[model samples]
Target chain A: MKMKLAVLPGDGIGPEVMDAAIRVLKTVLDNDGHEAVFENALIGGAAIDEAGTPLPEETLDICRRSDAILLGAVGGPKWDHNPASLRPEKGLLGLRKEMGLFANLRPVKAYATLLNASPLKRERVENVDLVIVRELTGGLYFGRPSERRGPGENEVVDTLAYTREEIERIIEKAFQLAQIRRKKLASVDKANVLESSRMWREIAEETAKKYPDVELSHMLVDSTSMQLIANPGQFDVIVTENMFGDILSDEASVITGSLGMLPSASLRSDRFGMYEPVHGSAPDIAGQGKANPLGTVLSAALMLRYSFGLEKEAAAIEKAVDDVLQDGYCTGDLQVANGKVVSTIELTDRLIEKLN
Target chain B: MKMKLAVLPGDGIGPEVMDAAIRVLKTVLDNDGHEAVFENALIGGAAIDEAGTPLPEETLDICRRSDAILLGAVGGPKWDHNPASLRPEKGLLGLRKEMGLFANLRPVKAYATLLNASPLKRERVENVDLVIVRELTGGLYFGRPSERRGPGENEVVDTLAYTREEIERIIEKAFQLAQIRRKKLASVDKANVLESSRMWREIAEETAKKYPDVELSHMLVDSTSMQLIANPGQFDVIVTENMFGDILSDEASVITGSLGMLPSASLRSDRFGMYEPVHGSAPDIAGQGKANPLGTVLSAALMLRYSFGLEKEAAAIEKAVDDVLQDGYCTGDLQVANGKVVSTIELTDRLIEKLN
Candidate 1:
């Protein structure tokens, strides 16, 4: 099989980590007897510096043509003063909108070896693996009539509007993911209060009919917030709106105690997906050879599984990463005692050696 | 000083817990050389059954005439199927609106004796004493135009509106509360996205001028959610709008491990306040003498401090409850190992004995 990948190493430590990710990807493909083509493009701060724009037409064309997209990280203090339209983050948002990427998948796994690192008790965090399927494009953030009005300019209103089509697509995506995983889906909403949430609930029920193998249950958003802390292990896949997802995914990610070890994937209806680390570009540590590359490496694994449907190759990469952690190999950010702290290139080398 | 207190024991374990609270309140007042008069009234399911309305006019009149109000838990399976207008929770909401209780204060304290009960590690939960001062009347939950619309009923919209006056008053309340405590306030909002939140942040900044001694900081609501779990001790006080508060307060309260041990207060600008347990009516354990009474008793303590300005008296009640817990007295719900599980009357008797 042949794969075409678009690499966007935006700014700061992005280039360093993306280099490490590409190395691991090439090694995996070689081991699996697969052929691949790679294309490099500029985005975010890098694109802004060279092209006077965060996202250029040339980069979008490359991403649209590729089977999968791998992004390192974007933004720094250099572009911090820029207006909203010219901001580095705007580039990422623009890509999501242009690509019609409506679903964001965040997989949270609390490794047994890192259980003690979590703030939660070991019993609560150990063996906890779940995915948060967040509807990325709809809800309050983009709703219309979000303006200030009323006599004396006294009041401001933000609309939280949702249509059946938008809700159905996201619900269907979550149901399909659940069908492939543990066959359990926890649909979270505030039905008792919000009119939008009630419609979301109705759409979820309607979508559940098509996935007979999946077990569906509904939880109030407030109760779900508490349950995430009380017993997060009980959840397999949690589906929620943009706002709730934004909060919950972050909450769930931090439970692992290592923010640099998580990866995220944003997807459309097709197999094309954008994979990136949950962590931001650490501009302070850029070019220091101390940044962790495991998150970016794992994101490549997600691309292999979700975009290319190469489950065996994806599992091999995951196993190598797990074996590295089990063997007490730590990065500076992880600070694992009795473990050797390796640099980005060294960690990638170790992963490749373990794969063989 | 003289005080008039309205006691509303609504349904299920409401009466059992209310009796225990009154006993503790009377004992504390007598010991502190304070004079008080108590009047009993009906609300919630009881009011619905007797007066055909959740909030009766006579009950409102009694509450209006009183200095403070004490409420036990409301609602049960008996009234679970009632119409929306006749629901037991409406009584509580009605009282908040009718009495102009615009601020809700939830004080979360992790006691040393109960540190092991929490799901979080001991170090993370220990010494976590913070207050969540939430605006109770405005924001998405009560905003107008929250309805289902669009042709074929394909969409729903929930308005999140806020006025300058509303935001100003709540910000002032939080700043004042911070002045009395640790002098640190965290104003929570989604200002990056919502117009209402932007206005809220602006008012919070304006209100901070009046509180020169208080340290005010702004945090996005999503980040605050993670911080509540990651490092709760960092927060002295958190103030936000109605919907955010409803979710965050519940999340913060559960961190104490013993839900039945937390108390809440709803207040206006005046001395008038409504104090109650953070827990709900446990219909399954009703009339069994097993429901925890410490929450209700502690709420009586809040009434002394906030409504009557009797700081010494409030401290006495809090000390008594703490002493009882330290002495290995627990309720069935708490399940404190090696501690004796006491009934409602027995626990109240212990509290009174400690007061003496």
Candidate 2:
């Protein structure tokens, strides 16, 4: 498939790692007889510097024209002093809102070579392979009436609101993904206590009829949190509301080795989505070549699989990453005893070599 | 101090553990030169069976006459088919709401003898002794408009409301507890996104003035979840609103050993509170004499310190529990390779022996 991809390498090591991911993406795509034409766009502090807004209209236009979007990372100390509207993070947050991306997917996989790096016992974390599908655009974060109330302004209220459609989209997305992978989806909610959860549970149960092959299990939000650490292996895909997802995804991230190796994808209804490394843009190591590029490469892999529907091509990139790490070639961020520490370029080069 | 206490040993293993705790409490109180009067009350499944209601009127009357309340575990399979209002768990919930118990305190302490029982590595969980102070009566749990909204009920809304007094009281409770312990408090809130959290942050900052001796640090709820698993020892008192607390406290519970040894306390404005085990009523092991009494015993220890203001007496019970576990006399639930498994009466007898 031919792809029009808008590539935003925002700031700091973002540009560096993004450059490395493009090389690996090109290698895998070219080898698999696929082609992707990339367009560079300014965002984050870079956009704030050139266009006076963290998310520029021109960049949005470019992104709209593309089949898929890939962002390296956003934010830096340079734009830290800016107001909330003009901050570098606003670029990323703005893009999500503008694009109507509702579902945020984070895959937590325990790598064989990095088992010892986990704070959890190896046995408890060794078989950890789960994806937390979070409803990003709705729930408590965006709810209104979030202000002080009553006569003395002593009482405060924040709303936790969700439309039936909002819950349905995220739940269906999780079930479809689960059917293809492990055929099990854990829909987490506080059903016994919260009305929003009851609605969520109803939507999830209603959505399950569409996917006969996949199994559905209803779990409480609090219980899911405990089960994540106690026995992470039992879960395949965990779908939940925005706030619960935010807390659980962050908690699940630590079950693996390094934060520098995780990738995330945010999507709306269709295939068009934004993929990015979970790690931030490190200004301190922007040009030092010490930043890990595999996260970005994996994000590119996610873009290939989800956005472009190129499963084998994505697998080539993913398997290449696994092979390189298995052979003990990793970046400084990953802790591997007696392993060789390669630069960003060198790691990407090694991954490219493994792709063929 | 002469004490008037209401003892509601609710269901299943509840009565057994309650008997064991009462025995231990009596032994400790007598040894410490104190007087106590105990009145047994019906609650939970037992109350539903005998009084046709989970929280009987007689039980409410008895609880009102007491300085403090002690509950064994509530809920059993007997009331699983009952409606929400008539469920066995409602008895416990009713007590909290009726008595205005707002703050739920759960201490996650990694025992030296049970470090291996943790899913986390030994070093990561070894020094974990943090108390999670949750505002129980308010926030998402009991918030208003918690029902389907809009035309056709396509949308849903749940309110997260907090009064200034509610926030102040819980924060003060945490600070006062911290001032007596390690003198550090981590106030967890989603201040950046939610207005309620911003108000919580402001209240926490203002309340800090009253507790100049105790250090205060504000943490985002998401970050606190990660920190709980990554570096749990850094936290002393982690105070947060209901929903976040519900998720995090459960996450923190797994950082320690068996749930059989964990204790929790629900408090209001003053010394009046209700204490119970973090575990549940296991009907399968109800009358076998295999129930672990340490959690209830520890809850009794909490009662001594918080309700009766007998710190030394509480320490004696706590030290006795630790010594008993260290000496390898434990219940069946706890995993100790070279340990001798004791019944409920045996463990209580051993703990009583260690009190002197």
Candidate 3:
């Protein structure tokens, strides 16, 4: 199969990590005798500096032309003081809106090597692996009237708006995802209180009929948060709206010990997909050459599987990452007891070695 | 001082627990030279069966005339299939709104004996004593548009609305409450994404200026939920809107080993308040004598302090209950690790004994 990939190296150590993911990708394509092409574009804080906007026309053009997209970290302190519209995060949020990337999938899994790093006891966090499918664009985050009403003594209202189409698509996506995994879905909402949740539940019930193989249960968002921490392995695919998704996904990430090892893919049914590490652009460690490269590398694997539909290629990349971690090779963020502490380049090299 | 108390022994084991609380109150007040007159009323499933109304007009009259109100749990599976308007939970929700009880304060503390029963390891949960000051009346839980839109389409929406005055008042109340205890307040919001959150942060910041004696900090609701489990003792007063508060307070309750051990008070600034156990009307255990009575007893203690400003009387009730728990006497819920299992009546008798 032939594939053209648009790569946005983003900012700070983004370029450094993208280099590693690209190296692994090239190795896998060559061994499999597959045709693949890559194009680089600027985004986030880097684009802000060069193009005066985070989502430059050139970047969007490259994304439009590519079969899949891989993005490194975005934003840094240099762009932090900028207005909200010009901020680097706007680039990613804008791209999602423009591309209609409605389903944001984040998988939280505990790696054997980093299990001890979790604050939860080994018995509780062990064998914990779950995927969170959050609705990317609707609910309180994008609701109109979502602005400061006035100055002091003034008020602000962030509406939690959800159309039937919005609720149906997201809930449908969750059920479909559940069909591929453990066949269990926990539909989280505040049905007892929120109208949106009541609708969400009704849609979930309606959607469940389409997938008879999938079992569905409703949980309140708060109880879901507690259950996620108390017992994560019990969940398969947790689907909810934007704000709840954001909070719940973050909670799930800590169960794996560190945010540096996580990856996410935001997708639309059609158009282009955006892939990035679940970890934020740590402006604190942006240029240290010490950022964890594994998250980006893993995200590249997700792009291959989810966006490009190359299952074997994605599996090969995942296997390489596990092999490298098993060999006690990691960046500064992953400090295992009595284990080797490798730099960013070294960790990437070890993962690349596994691809060959 | 003389007081008129409205006693609504709701449903299930509610009567037994309310009886226990009343006995303890009488034992303590007898020696203090103060008389507390009791006006018994029916509520929940019991009221529905007897008076065909969950909260009768006469019950409201009794509550309005009383110096304070003590309620046991409401609703049970027996009323679960009833119409929405006839459901017993309606009474509880109605009372809070009708009485203008806008702020809910839930104290989550791990008792020494039941600490081992927490889902979290002992070290993570030990010594966790914090109060959640939740804005009870506004936000998504009770906001407008809380209903389905179309027929059979399964679409709904719930508004998350707040006024600056509402946010400021609740935040101010939280800071004031924090000053009396640990002197630290964590204002939880989703400022990064929600409009209401941004206003929430601004109001909390402005409110903090008036409280120079109390220390205040901010945390995203998601991060706060994680930290609450990771390090439960780091908080003093955690204040947030209705939905977040509902979820957070419930999570806090679970950390205390037994959910039945938790107690709460809902109050308005005008010295008007309502007291109830954090546990719901467990329809499963409704008619059985197995329901835990300690929570109701603790709630009465809260009523004495917050409603009547009888701190010494409240302390006497609290201490007596504490001593009883310390003596290894337990209700069914607290009977763990070979702990003494006392009947509902037996536990109440022991608490009354300590009061006298």
RMSD over all Cα atoms, model 2 = 1.5
**Candidate 3 lDDT for residue A305:** 76
Give the 10-residue window scoring lowest on summed lDDT in candidate 3 chain B.
Answer: B147-156
Model 1 bad stretches (over 4 Å): none
**lDDT, model 1, position A274:** 96
- List model 1 lDDT by residue over A88-171, tens digit each: 888898987888999999998876667667878878878688999999888888887888886988988898888888898889
- lDDT tens digits, residue span B1-356, model 2: 78998999889899888887888888888855688999999999999999889999999999999999999878888789889789888888888889999999998787888888889999898888899999987898778978887699898899998899999999989998899889999999999999989999999999999999999999999999889988998999999998889889898888876566899899988899999988899988899989999899899989888887889888888999888998987878898546899899999899888877
- Candidate 3 residue-wise lDDT, A1-356, digit = tens: 77889898887778888888888888887886779899999889989999788898888888888877888888788987888878788888877777678999998877777766776666777788788989977788777667655566365666777888888888887787788678999998877667777778888998899999999999988888768766778988889988888778877777767567788988776535788887777767766778888888889888887776677988899889888877777777885544677778788888878877
Candidate 3 clashes between residue pairs 3 or more apart in a chain or in different chains: B77-B283
Q: Is candidate 1 or candidate 2 better by DockQ?
A: 2
Docking class for model 3 is medium
RMSD values for the candidates in order, in angstroms, are 1.5, 1.5, 3.1
lDDT of 2 by residue, A20-109 (tens): 999988877775577779999999999999988999999999999998899998888987778988978899989988998989999988
Instruction: Please report the TM-score between candidate 2 and the true structure.
Output: 0.97
lDDT of each: 0.87, 0.89, 0.81
